[PDB]
Design an enzyme around this catalytic site. Structure first.
Site, PDB file in Angstrom:
ATOM      1  N   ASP A 148       0.926  -1.070  -0.101  1.00 23.67           N
ATOM      2  CA  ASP A 148       0.019  -0.057   0.031  1.00 23.67           C
ATOM      3  C   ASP A 148       0.839   1.249   0.097  1.00 23.67           C
ATOM      4  OD1 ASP A 148      -1.755  -2.076   0.484  1.00 23.67           O
ATOM      5  OD2 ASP A 148      -1.793  -1.663   2.646  1.00 23.67           O
ATOM      6  N   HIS A 151      -4.815  -2.532  -5.842  1.00 22.15           N
ATOM      7  CA  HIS A 151      -3.978  -1.144  -6.219  1.00 22.15           C
ATOM      8  C   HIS A 151      -4.951  -0.116  -6.751  1.00 22.15           C
ATOM      9  CE1 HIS A 151      -0.216  -4.092  -7.013  1.00 22.15           C
ATOM     10  NE2 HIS A 151      -0.486  -3.880  -5.653  1.00 22.15           N
TER      11      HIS A 151
HETATM   12  N1  LIG Z   1      -2.928  11.611   0.171  1.00 18.54           N
HETATM   13  C1  LIG Z   1      -2.512  10.832  -0.678  1.00 18.54           C
HETATM   14  N2  LIG Z   1      -3.022   9.718  -0.969  1.00 18.54           N
HETATM   15  C2  LIG Z   1      -2.144   8.899  -1.757  1.00 18.54           C
HETATM   16  C3  LIG Z   1      -0.887   9.166  -2.600  1.00 18.54           C
HETATM   17  N3  LIG Z   1      -0.551   8.232  -3.557  1.00 18.54           N
HETATM   18  C4  LIG Z   1      -1.475   7.215  -3.296  1.00 18.54           C
HETATM   19  N4  LIG Z   1      -2.527   7.611  -2.161  1.00 18.54           N
HETATM   20  C5  LIG Z   1      -3.681   6.745  -1.925  1.00 18.54           C
HETATM   21  O1  LIG Z   1      -3.131   6.038  -0.797  1.00 18.54           O
HETATM   22  C6  LIG Z   1      -3.609   4.611  -0.965  1.00 18.54           C
HETATM   23  C7  LIG Z   1      -2.689   3.587  -0.992  1.00 18.54           C
HETATM   24  O2  LIG Z   1      -3.381   2.280  -1.092  1.00 18.54           O
HETATM   25  P1  LIG Z   1      -3.223   1.263  -2.040  1.00 18.54           P
HETATM   26  O3  LIG Z   1      -3.763   1.816  -3.477  1.00 18.54           O
HETATM   27  O4  LIG Z   1      -3.802   0.005  -1.636  1.00 18.54           O
HETATM   28  O5  LIG Z   1      -1.342   1.037  -2.438  1.00 18.54           O
HETATM   29  P2  LIG Z   1      -0.874   0.221  -3.516  1.00 18.54           P
HETATM   30  O6  LIG Z   1      -0.898  -1.244  -3.124  1.00 18.54           O
HETATM   31  O7  LIG Z   1       0.701   0.492  -3.303  1.00 18.54           O
HETATM   32  O8  LIG Z   1      -1.331   0.420  -4.817  1.00 18.54           O
HETATM   33  C8  LIG Z   1      -4.884   4.694  -2.133  1.00 18.54           C
HETATM   34  O9  LIG Z   1      -6.029   4.983  -1.759  1.00 18.54           O
HETATM   35  C9  LIG Z   1      -4.300   5.857  -2.819  1.00 18.54           C
HETATM   36  O10 LIG Z   1      -5.278   6.333  -3.891  1.00 18.54           O
HETATM   37  C10 LIG Z   1      -0.458  10.304  -2.043  1.00 18.54           C
HETATM   38  O11 LIG Z   1       0.649  10.835  -2.502  1.00 18.54           O
HETATM   39  N5  LIG Z   1      -1.343  11.204  -1.249  1.00 18.54           N
HETATM   40  O1  LIG Z   2      -1.582 -14.632   2.542  1.00 17.18           O
HETATM   41  P1  LIG Z   2      -1.912 -12.967   2.259  1.00 17.18           P
HETATM   42  O2  LIG Z   2      -3.364 -12.998   2.027  1.00 17.18           O
HETATM   43  O3  LIG Z   2      -1.113 -12.504   1.112  1.00 17.18           O
HETATM   44  O4  LIG Z   2      -1.598 -12.149   3.704  1.00 17.18           O
HETATM   45  C1  LIG Z   2      -0.221 -12.329   4.180  1.00 17.18           C
HETATM   46  C2  LIG Z   2      -0.157 -11.013   4.887  1.00 17.18           C
HETATM   47  O5  LIG Z   2       0.252 -10.114   3.916  1.00 17.18           O
HETATM   48  C3  LIG Z   2      -0.395  -8.740   3.926  1.00 17.18           C
HETATM   49  N1  LIG Z   2      -0.818  -8.446   2.641  1.00 17.18           N
HETATM   50  C4  LIG Z   2      -0.729  -9.108   1.532  1.00 17.18           C
HETATM   51  N2  LIG Z   2      -0.676  -8.481   0.268  1.00 17.18           N
HETATM   52  C5  LIG Z   2      -0.898  -7.148   0.813  1.00 17.18           C
HETATM   53  C6  LIG Z   2      -0.696  -5.793   0.187  1.00 17.18           C
HETATM   54  O6  LIG Z   2      -0.578  -5.857  -1.040  1.00 17.18           O
HETATM   55  P2  LIG Z   2      -0.566  -4.469  -2.343  1.00 17.18           P
HETATM   56  O7  LIG Z   2       0.490  -3.591  -1.492  1.00 17.18           O
HETATM   57  O8  LIG Z   2      -0.315  -5.120  -3.652  1.00 17.18           O
HETATM   58  O9  LIG Z   2      -1.844  -3.962  -2.110  1.00 17.18           O
HETATM   59  N3  LIG Z   2      -0.946  -4.809   0.782  1.00 17.18           N
HETATM   60  C7  LIG Z   2      -0.827  -4.749   2.120  1.00 17.18           C
HETATM   61  N4  LIG Z   2      -0.596  -5.985   2.897  1.00 17.18           N
HETATM   62  C8  LIG Z   2      -0.821  -7.096   1.972  1.00 17.18           C
HETATM   63  C9  LIG Z   2      -2.012  -9.353   4.509  1.00 17.18           C
HETATM   64  O10 LIG Z   2      -2.604  -8.335   5.132  1.00 17.18           O
HETATM   65  C10 LIG Z   2      -1.251 -10.448   5.666  1.00 17.18           C
HETATM   66  O11 LIG Z   2      -0.822  -9.522   6.840  1.00 17.18           O
HETATM   67  O1  LIG Z   3      -4.383  -2.994  -0.823  1.00 15.64           O
HETATM   68  C1  LIG Z   3      -4.669  -4.272  -0.135  1.00 15.64           C
HETATM   69  N1  LIG Z   3      -4.340  -4.195   1.297  1.00 15.64           N
HETATM   70  O2  LIG Z   3      -4.175  -3.120   1.864  1.00 15.64           O
HETATM   71  C2  LIG Z   3      -4.767  -5.325   1.824  1.00 15.64           C
HETATM   72  C3  LIG Z   3      -6.033  -5.595   2.630  1.00 15.64           C
HETATM   73  O3  LIG Z   3      -6.929  -4.750   2.041  1.00 15.64           O
HETATM   74  O4  LIG Z   3      -6.088  -6.190   3.580  1.00 15.64           O
HETATM   75 MG   LIG Z   4      -2.634  -2.020  -1.739  1.00 16.28          MG
END
Ligand SMILES: Nc1nc2c(ncn2[C@@H]2O[C@H](COP(=O)(O)OP(=O)(O)O)[C@@H](O)[C@H]2O)c(=O)[nH]1
Ligand SMILES: O=P(O)(O)OC[C@H]1O[C@@H](n2cnc3c(OP(=O)(O)O)ncnc32)[C@H](O)[C@@H]1O
Ligand SMILES: O=CN(O)CC(=O)O
Ligand SMILES: [Mg+2]
Ligand SMILES: Nc1nc2c(ncn2[C@@H]2O[C@H](COP(=O)(O)OP(=O)(O)O)[C@@H](O)[C@H]2O)c(=O)[nH]1
Ligand SMILES: O=P(O)(O)OC[C@H]1O[C@@H](n2cnc3c(OP(=O)(O)O)ncnc32)[C@H](O)[C@@H]1O
Ligand SMILES: O=CN(O)CC(=O)O
Ligand SMILES: [Mg+2]
EC number: 6.3.4.4
Lengths: 424, 424
Positions: A13, A41
């Site tokens: 994330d 994502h």
């Molecule tokens: N305020 C803020 N939010 C951001 C920024 N970049 C990403 N986000 C938000 O932060 C969150 C990150 O969660 P996620 O999308 O799961 O991360 P990912 O797995 O790396 O794609 C999302 O809801 C994005 O829209 C930033 O520069 N500022």
């Molecule tokens: O067997 P799993 O379901 O993979 O769970 C194992 C551990 O890993 C965490 N986890 C797995 N993918 C994750 C993710 O991916 P993205 O950044 O691509 O969105 N972002 C955040 N946390 C993540 C789960 O919450 C748990 O602690």
């Molecule tokens: O973007 C995915 N995660 O942050 C993991 C979850 O939703 O548990």
């Molecule tokens: Mg994520």
């Protein structure tokens, strides 16, 4: 910069989907190579958010080609949903590895069974319950069914039955609707069969044709099955070695690696978190940055940035440049703490640079050493240039670059595609 | 040439242990990074053979440092035996990854249980029954116990009991001598605890100190869990991506990759083998080259060299230079056939270059296309230079280099360390 890998350097994330969408404007192919739908994502354009779990985040471009590598565990049901949600002629530019493993509903059931058992033992991992671990387990046992098999429904149906019967017996899953899932896969067979191809050759051919490839990492380094905070990690290789093993291209094909680093830390699920802030500052980070699981909606644990962690990840993934994200969330805090070292509470000795106490029982012995940074009250989500940022933000950014000996190229100041500052 | 990886390009037993021993004369560190004791690497000096399964093949040098990476599944019992067999002060230069997984006897039991079940189904893999698959499975499920835990016997004993009880229940293993294995691990704890270290930092530090590192591959490319002839493969990443994920170093640290290619093909276990020779020529290859499993003693299946396979592997691992081995075994054959293409028996179309029918049901549709090469009757185990080899051998070698667009640097003409020709 023809072949770029985007890898999260923390516990996921970090904002991977955002930079992928951004960079996909100038890329030909965007590929996923590890994990599956546990990944969440988020893409945001003009505040309209889109969340992908299996398809790469380059889908918003009518010309972009999506590739799912061999190293993934694909919940086909979810895949179909995302495909239809995108619509258009996405299928004509979708390439699904015939070597990727199929994740069935029973994989999710086992995931929950295992977690339920561990919960009673007080050692649950806190998985996303998307059946990722169990699917990689059947891969290792070599009884998993791979995508290529789905191209022949006759053969698939027969193999499907045997895997499910075996797993039902193994885990005492008394009832599972095989007929329903089977019939659904027939539909998957029909709409996806011609898109299940040899991604190895597709990748090599396109690379030879000087195509620009964006490699989208799932999960992150500290969740790596090998290098993460085991057992609190995912079961796939989320690091650089995984880009090659999960996609079928060799190391010389990778031009550079972008490390996605959030301005502060978050992790969702159980496990160690040395700089965790389970207080009001943590609440500030979670609320201003709306830190809730893109996949499970679970509230994310928040804490201060961890430099030792990043030096460790740099050793593992190598980092050519950094994408420092969500800096805008830190606006308003009177002070920001950067963890620059870890001190052993028992011996009083400092943790060696590049090392990281990944083991829960070893982590427990460490205390973070913080460097104080003055905060800034300005809303920086409007800043377009690095020089436009308040001084205290610059110092934070510069301090990070210095400690990691790595340049911060993209600064994130908002969830939208546009909310990105480029540090020339 | 400071960091070299030796990777088998076929189905193992290409002669990896031999080149590792040879090159270890000028290396500081030799590392294993994948698989476990399923591997059987033979070293021969003055005809005295030594076979290693877990320790790297640089052990014959009093100054060489042995490293077992995080990506391995280690049967500690076997490890201890090899350590004591080597003797000397090997321990003072042994570095065992604290992240590597411990392979217990029960892992082997499950391996046999699974194979027995599949045998009745007519789909046994033909594993080495060394418990490799089940150990990678518990790694994925994240209940496996890693080496670092063995450093604290109190904690280890408790975790050990829980894993074994869980597995006994899961696979109905009614009786397992926990007390015997536990007490044995206490001994392992005592003699190995101080050698269970942070290989990540050790590797980075030594690389920074300009140390020369030799990376020893286990198994081979066509046995890769992802890229091999699934399900007839091993459960670890045996390809280049695995060098990084199994050792904890990034892709820029790897200077070159040597592909170990046997002059003819062998594979031991079930699965497809397009150029298999189940006739007298196969017998000639097996007997002259004594093709019996270094680990299981099983007779190896023999066949002609496969070029399409190597082009596929080149795409995956990349090959800077080739070590063409056992060329001496081909002495005496009136003709040698090189498989330069595969033709589909049903459609009549040729297999695309770089592609390989890894799936059993797809492989079945292909027919090998051979190029005839005149043989040579001379005993070449005495040849010291490339020019000293009979002309027909040169043509074979040159033909191979041409088709793979890769230089053949080391020619093997005997099992001994000295039996190697260097092609300047
Ligand atoms: N305020 C803020 N939010 C951001 C920024 N970049 C990403 N986000 C938000 O932060 C969150 C990150 O969660 P996620 O999308 O799961 O991360 P990912 O797995 O790396 O794609 C999302 O809801 C994005 O829209 C930033 O520069 N500022
Ligand atoms: O067997 P799993 O379901 O993979 O769970 C194992 C551990 O890993 C965490 N986890 C797995 N993918 C994750 C993710 O991916 P993205 O950044 O691509 O969105 N972002 C955040 N946390 C993540 C789960 O919450 C748990 O602690
Ligand atoms: O973007 C995915 N995660 O942050 C993991 C979850 O939703 O548990
Ligand atoms: Mg994520
Ligand atoms: N005749 C001959 N035998 C060789 C040569 N190189 C290696 N060998 C032998 O061939 C066998 C190969 O098996 P093995 O050691 O399991 O291969 P590894 O897994 O790649 O180390 C061993 O018994 C070696 O001693 C060579 O050039 N000629
Ligand atoms: O689950 P496993 O026990 O790994 O068995 C899976 C399949 O892989 C084969 N195999 C595994 N390691 C092998 C090896 O390694 P080295 O070259 O390092 O000596 N050389 C040859 N064949 C090898 C086994 O025979 C079986 O077909
Ligand atoms: O060297 C090891 N093998 O050839 C595998 C086996 O012995 O089965
Ligand atoms: Mg061998």
């Amino acid at each position: 910069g023809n072949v770029v890998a985007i890898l999260g350097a923390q516990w996921g994330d970090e904002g991977k989907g955002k930079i992928i969408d951004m960079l996909s404007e100038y890329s030909d192919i965007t590929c996923r190579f590890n994990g599956g739908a546990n990944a969440g994502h988020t893409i945001s354009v003009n505040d309209k958010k889109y969340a992908l779990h299996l398809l790469p985040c380059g889908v918003l471009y009518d010309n972009n080609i999506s590739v799912l590598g061999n190293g993934m565990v694909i919940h086909v049901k979810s895949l179909m949903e995302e495909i239809e949600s995108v619509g258009g002629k996405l299928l004509d530019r979708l390439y699904l590895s015939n070597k990727a493993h199929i994740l069935f509903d029973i994989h999710q059931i086992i995931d929950s069974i295992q977690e339920t058992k561990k919960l009673k033992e007080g050692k649950q991992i806190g998985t996303t319950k998307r059946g990722i671990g169990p699917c990689y387990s059947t891969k290792a046992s070599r009884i998993g069914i791979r995508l290529g098999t789905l191209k022949n429904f006759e053969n698939f149906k027969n193999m499907y039955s045997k895997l499910i019967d075996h797993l039902m017996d193994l885990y005492n899953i008394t009832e599972y609707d095989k007929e329903k899932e089977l019939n659904l896969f027939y539909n998957y067979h029909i709409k996806l069969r011609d898109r299940i191809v040899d991604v190895i050759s597709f990748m090599n051919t396109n690379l030879e044709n000087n195509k620009k490839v964006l490699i989208e990492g799932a999960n992150a380094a500290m969740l790596d099955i090998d290098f993460g905070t085991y057992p609190y990690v995912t079961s796939s290789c989320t690091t650089v070695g995984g880009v090659f093993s999960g996609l079928g291209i060799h190391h010389k094909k990778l031009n550079l690696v972008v490390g996605v680093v959030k301005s502060y830390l978050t992790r969702v699920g159980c496990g160690p978190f040395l700089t965790e802030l389970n207080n009001d500052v943590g609440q500030y980070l979670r609320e201003k940055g709306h830190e809730y699981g893109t996949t499970t909606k679970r509230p994310r644990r928040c804490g201060w940035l961890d430099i030792p962690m990043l030096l460790y990840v740099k050793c593992i993934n190598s980092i050519d440049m950094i994408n420092l994200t969500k800096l805008d969330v830190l606006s308003g805090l009177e002070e920001i703490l950067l963890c620059v070292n870890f001190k052993n509470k028992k011996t009083g000795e400092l943790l060696e640079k590049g090392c990281y106490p990944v083991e829960e029982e070893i982590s427990e012995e460490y205390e973070p050493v913080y460097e104080k940074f003055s905060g800034w009250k300005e809303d920086i989500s409007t800043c377009n240039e690095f020089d436009e940022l308040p001084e205290n933000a610059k110092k934070y950014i510069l301090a990070i670059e210095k400690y990691l000996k790595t340049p911060i190229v993209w600064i994130g100041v908002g969830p939208n595609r546009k909310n990105m500052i480029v540090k020339k």
